Design a protein around this ligand. Sequence first.
Ligand SMILES: Cn1cc(-c2cc(-c3cc(Cl)c(F)c(OCc4ccccc4Cl)c3)c(=O)n(-c3cccnc3)c2)c(=O)[nH]c1=O
Ligand SMILES: Cn1cc(-c2cc(-c3cc(Cl)c(F)c(OCc4ccccc4Cl)c3)c(=O)n(-c3cccnc3)c2)c(=O)[nH]c1=O
Lengths: 305, 305
Amino acid sequence: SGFRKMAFPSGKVEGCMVQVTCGTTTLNGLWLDDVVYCPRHVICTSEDMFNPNYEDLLIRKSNHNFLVQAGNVQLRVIGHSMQNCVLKLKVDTANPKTPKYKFVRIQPGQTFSVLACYNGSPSGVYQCAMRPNFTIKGSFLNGSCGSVGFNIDYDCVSFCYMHHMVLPTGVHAGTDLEGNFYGPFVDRQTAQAAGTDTTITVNVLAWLYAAVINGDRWFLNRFTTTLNDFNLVAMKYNYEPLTQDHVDILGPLSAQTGIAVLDMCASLKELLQNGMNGRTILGSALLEDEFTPFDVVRQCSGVTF
Amino acid sequence: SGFRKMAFPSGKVEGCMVQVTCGTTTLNGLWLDDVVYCPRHVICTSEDMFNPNYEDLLIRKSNHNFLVQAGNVQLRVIGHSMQNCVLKLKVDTANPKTPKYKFVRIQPGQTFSVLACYNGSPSGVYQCAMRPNFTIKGSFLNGSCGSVGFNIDYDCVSFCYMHHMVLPTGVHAGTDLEGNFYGPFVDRQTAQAAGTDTTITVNVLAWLYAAVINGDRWFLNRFTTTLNDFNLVAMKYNYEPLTQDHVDILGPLSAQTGIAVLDMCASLKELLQNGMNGRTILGSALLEDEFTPFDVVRQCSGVTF
Ligand SMILES: Cn1cc(-c2cc(-c3cc(Cl)c(F)c(OCc4ccccc4Cl)c3)c(=O)n(-c3cccnc3)c2)c(=O)[nH]c1=O
Ligand SMILES: Cn1cc(-c2cc(-c3cc(Cl)c(F)c(OCc4ccccc4Cl)c3)c(=O)n(-c3cccnc3)c2)c(=O)[nH]c1=O
């Protein structure tokens, strides 16, 4: 009963967060095995950020110019390298709290938990979605760079995001753990447009299934639609087109509730054309698109880790 | 930049979660030092729940009838006692991961993080508020009993909630860690009304300050009000009365933004009387009341733990 925006338990990631200092700049790093990962702009000063030559800047740094602390445990840096937009510092000690982990590049529309950190110390945890335009709508202040996003699969942490910057529009951009930005963005203080964003249709549908399961049912109607007819409405309202692959991903929820996917599409079509008429769904007066079908099933089934 | 419903990092609580089994019943317990805390209905069968005599039921249990596992570490039970609605099992081993902690009874309108658990294994973490009627709007499935709510203050975990039950209305009820229920509720399967609930006015005001800080400003107007005039509107819309103590708690946010508390009350009054006109505030089409003034300052200042 109930439906909340729920994050993964963050303990396994907390034990990997460290503080990385290079000269005047300090930010967050991720210590896994004997490597620390952090944004490469740790090597920049404020003046460098407008058109940094990162290869040139890194050449002026030696191992001993990087200080890494895990709590008050000082780590010794014995190597450094740059991979795309991330810096990898080899340290002389393997993190004893390293969880089972992998690095994943997530798809737009997928969700993950963010552990927001400052000066290497965890501050809070929240859930969010990779937007279709490869931004995230996070909560980040100065000093949060290097905070990571992740999913947890039983005992395995899949790291998918490292925070690098806030755009002038107030939305957030970052990389995977190989240092490749999501979206068109560069780690430079220069004008950068984010794409037109859209609403994640398959997630909205999943959330409507979650609502029915919890007893919010007023939006169910006697109409149906076709995939093609629904997608005409999706395009008008700036929703992502629904594909058969999306229909298939909703199969388990359709099976549990007995509501065909295209009938739920007919409900969503009426909500888009008519609004909510002052009503709410799972405590929201908007259509929510940051729960995936997997999220809904996990929360409506009680999967643990 | 951004504003999210943010939970505390849960690692310190994860290391305290255990599985408690008594006969057929298994649920979650909290292992601190050499004591495990859990709901006393762990000693009940389904048939006992309608009018249980907990003193009589506990008399039929011995130390060896309680099994406690922390992962695969089996704990030996060497004593048991009942305190109000909680059971305390003394074990032969102090939890080596016990954080600095205290037990707190929170006030209505205060927020806390919940670590939802199943069979002793953490599942997810979310933030929520103690409602004015002493329920919480959580996300709990069968098996979540014994999950705990908490706040973290640097290195100290203040445990304030243990989950006991879902009411027929789908809202959730529980105790403090001394086993005293919040609200009028009893741990019996019998009809139980929750009070009329109300909206947490001082929290809505805090969230409006958070919105201004983040650049959502359209609801600011040229009007003002008095405490008494505003409270006439509060009563009409089922908002808690605003007191001078509430005004004082909002002092820091007033000081940061330069918006007098009573001017923000004038904004809130207009929102209550006129609605949002199809607009949103911090991504919401409703007035949000589960952020306290402390929450807003923490998230808009970057406090870590
Ligand atoms: C040295 N240093 C730097 C940072 C840090 C750096 C950045 C940051 C990083 C890079 Cl590469 C940028 F190109 C950048 O230009 C922003 C911009 C301006 C104009 C047009 C386009 C763009 Cl993109 C900004 C940042 O945005 N933030 C931040 C702040 C608030 C919320 N989220 C992120 C923080 C830090 O945290 N710690 C630390 O020590
Ligand atoms: C043995 N056992 C029991 C539980 C367990 C017990 C309960 C539960 C506990 C007590 Cl004391 C009750 F009086 C109770 O009557 C509900 C009720 C019915 C009619 C009128 C008023 C009321 Cl109050 C229910 C529960 O509500 N839930 C639950 C389920 C879904 C979400 N949240 C909570 C779970 C468990 O999790 N594990 C485990 O082993």
